[PDB]
Structure 1
Amino acid sequence: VPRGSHMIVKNGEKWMDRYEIDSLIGKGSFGQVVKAYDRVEQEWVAIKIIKNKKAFLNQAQIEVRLLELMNKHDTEMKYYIVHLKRHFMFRNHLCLVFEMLSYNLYDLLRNTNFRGVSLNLTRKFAQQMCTALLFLATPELSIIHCDLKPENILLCNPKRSAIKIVDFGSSCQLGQRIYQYIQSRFYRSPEVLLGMPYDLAIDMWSLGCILVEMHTGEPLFSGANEVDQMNKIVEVLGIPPAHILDQAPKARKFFEKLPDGTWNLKKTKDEYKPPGTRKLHNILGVETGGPGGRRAGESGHTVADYLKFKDLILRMLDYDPKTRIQPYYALQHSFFA
């Protein structure tokens, strides 16, 4: 019986006279993902090997349940989610076999030297991701991904724009609270930072942050910690509405109520641009040739195009989860006309 939690996986070995292990795709907290040739079906597969650890096995069984639940819907919208082919136990690990995909949107950014992809490619990713979130919002699913980031969105094919969402290991359904901390820090919604109730709208917040990053090459809100995260959000979007902060268990982690009932930023221990002064209009370079002016004198990057993109992003980055744009309405936006 092995001591480590990780499965020993030797490149070139063959599992169950079926799966020819080629290479490691990536390692994580959960375990690893290996590229393997399925000799029975004659196709490449990504095998997700879960660590022999109770927390990770629990997460993986939830991910299996949610993926199988999505599998039974007929809609074309379901193909924006990675397809789980099968799962089995092997050398005492849960193994999930997925369709082989290409590299992730962070790798795509690194291949641009973090200068960003075109607004035309950003629009394509945006439409597919809004369609995927519409699928998760199906009432019988009502799945909150809770970890949307460039690394969990993968190209199907390296030469094409088709994408899929992977990793439902931190996911839950509408009304559940399972994990102390949720969302990757850069992509973490205000409601989660403020310890407030969360629904499917937190995934739309993450998408808004991701889409700006895909076009600029840099994270919109790159917090070192939760206080820095909230402060960088405030630089762009201003002090959150009073009706939110007044109900927020963790309002006083970031803000203080003054005697008039108005909220300001909490004092530092002892740096940020004033609230609302880091305008998204200028981050995107709407009037100034796009990010760093590098898009002036390309097509598909007009002021008209940028204004529609910014308007949609700011609807996705609404502080109020009740009024934040929902996938159904985002798809009708003139940005997609």
Structure 2
Amino acid sequence: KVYNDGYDDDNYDYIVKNGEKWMDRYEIDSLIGKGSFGQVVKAYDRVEQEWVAIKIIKNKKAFLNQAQIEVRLLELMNKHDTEMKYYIVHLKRHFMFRNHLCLVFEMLSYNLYDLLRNTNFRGVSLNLTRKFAQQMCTALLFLATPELSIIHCDLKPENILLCNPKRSAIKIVDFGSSCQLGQRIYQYIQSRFYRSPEVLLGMPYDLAIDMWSLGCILVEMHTGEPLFSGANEVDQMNKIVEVLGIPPAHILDQAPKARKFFEKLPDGTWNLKKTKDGKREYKPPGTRKLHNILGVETGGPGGRRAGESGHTVADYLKFKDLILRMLDYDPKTRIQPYYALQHSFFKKT
């Protein structure tokens, strides 16, 4: 049963072969990544004399047409940003090869999941978490500039890569899920752990959904574990409710899928759906305090940062305050990137 003349496999992916030369130019070293979109390979560019990364989009229409948007958007961002400046991966060129759209990128280093893993999920320091937060907020400031108005739509540790193994410099990758403020084209989006209330609730969204993600990410970066590790949409919403409480009546009143997670009393207040059989699985609303998760006054997450430098209680109080502003239920009031950069948490040395 041949797929695309035997170049693809049963899942519309190109069968990678180490040492293959493409178009008398690119030498394929190895497979280095995978995802919904397809594959990413490490390759040497004879012409330019450099190592690159080539993202090999799946050979199917729906997946192609989506990478076409990733290209349009990267080209548009690299056009403003021609100093490789603003914390966004660089699209060198692209081409069609054996019926696969291939995108050639600069070669980058570890993503932030690999980096968490490397500490055996103990978390990185608060100092380092600050650096990622400063850059990510700046990248998100960039994305918001009115010419662009770009929603990334799938922020997560795995889509933030270091430039260099032993350095804090980072770039955001994978704009395959991405869109612009007007041209909104989907319902079920963002990775689940990093999905915003408004998306869960089936409401319309804007750029603020990335900020939500960013909040989930920064906590995870310092503690080692996802702030809201939900196994599906109902679990996920419930894990958020543990920490932050019930979402304001004015939001739920507008949410088409409010009733998937909640129910409205006779008196007009909302509450979690009534459950069953003397079962209890979650902590009551608002009870899982972020104050304890970060371990503000107990030596950091898990007491593992006890009596270290640059982890004072004050550092944590700032860091906490920022994060609660990033996780505001209301997207009209969730801190925006301009203002986040001015937050106390960055006041200098």
TM range (shorter): over 0.9
Structure 1 residue 67: Cα displacement: 0.3
- Could you say what the CA RMSD is over the residues aligned between the two structures, in angstroms? 1.2
Structure 1 residue 268: Cα displacement: 3.0
Segments of structure 1 that go 5 or more residues without pairing to the other structure are 1-5
Structure 1 residue 228: Cα displacement: 0.6
Q: Which residue of 2 aligns with 1:3?
A: none
The structure 1 residue matched to 2:330, chosen from 310, 314, 320, is 320
TM-score (norm 2): 0.93
The structure 1 residue matched to 2:27, chosen from 20, 31, 56, is 20
Aligned CA distance change for structure 1 residues 77 and 230 (closer, same or farther; 3 Å): farther
Deviation sequence 1:133-187 (CA, Å, 0-9, x none): 0011010100000100001111111101111111111101003331231100000
Aligned CA distance change for structure 1 residues 261 and 306 (closer, same or farther; 3 Å): same
Deviation sequence 1:12-32 (CA, Å, 0-9, x none): 111122111111001222111
Deviation sequence 1:253-301 (CA, Å, 0-9, x none): 1111111111110123551111001000100001000000000121010
Greater alpha carbon shift after TM alignment, 275-284 vs 36-45: 36-45
Greater alpha carbon shift after TM alignment, 21-30 vs 143-152: 21-30
Deviation sequence 1:220-256 (CA, Å, 0-9, x none): 0001110110000000000001111111111111111
Segments of structure 2 that go 5 or more residues without pairing to the other structure are 1-12
Structure 1 residue 62: Cα displacement: 0.3
- Alpha carbons 1:149, 1:187 under 8 Å: kept: yes
- Alpha carbons 1:77, 1:131 under 8 Å: kept: no
User: Aligned pairs, how many?
Assistant: 332
Aligned CA distance change for structure 1 residues 135 and 93 (closer, same or farther; 3 Å): same
Structure 1 residue 77: Cα displacement: 8.3
Structure 1 residue 78: Cα displacement: 4.7
Structure 1 stretches of at least 4 aligned residues deviating more than 4 Å after TM superposition: 74-78
Distance (Å, rounded) in 2 between the aligned partners of 1:78 and 1:173: 21
- Partner secondary structure for residue 271 of structure 2: strand
- Partner secondary structure for residue 86 of structure 2: helix
Alignment of 1:100-179 (within 5 A): 100-179=107-186
- Alpha carbons 2:187, 2:199 under 8 Å: kept: no
Deviation sequence 1:187-220 (CA, Å, 0-9, x none): 0000000111100000000000000000000000
Structure 1 residue 76: Cα displacement: 5.9
Q: Does 1:191 align with 2:201?
A: no
